[PDB]
Amino acid sequence: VVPSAKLEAIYPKGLRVSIPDDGFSLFAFHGKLNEEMDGLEAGHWARDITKPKEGRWTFRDRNVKLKLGDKIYFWTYVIKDGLGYRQDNGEWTVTEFVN
Secondary structure (H helix, E strand, O other): OOOOOEEEEEOOOOEEEEEEOOOOOEEEEEEEEOOOOOOOOOOOEEEEEOOOEOOEEEEEEOOOOOOOOOEEEEEEEEEEOOEEEEEEEEEEEOOOEEO
16 A cells, blocks of 8 residues: 555664655654554654655654664554555564664
8 A cells, every 4th residue: 555664774873764755745654662552652753754855755863773683663654645544563673784
């Protein structure tokens, strides 16, 4: 349905989450570190992004140094033509860093 989120652990610090645009109007990321989502929680990370750049919708946080083995539990939201779509049950394990 909506694109699979690409999550990236940034070295030295941070997290990048993104999807490719397909004429969307909004992308939201909701994520928790090392703790499952209990329902549709706003999360530790929570932002609505309303401007795409370079054909993508990109969430960035530069506040967390992730550790190898850290897990992020998440959901996302996309608006297309006035209708909302969710990616549920997102789960990602930090296994490499990206510069």
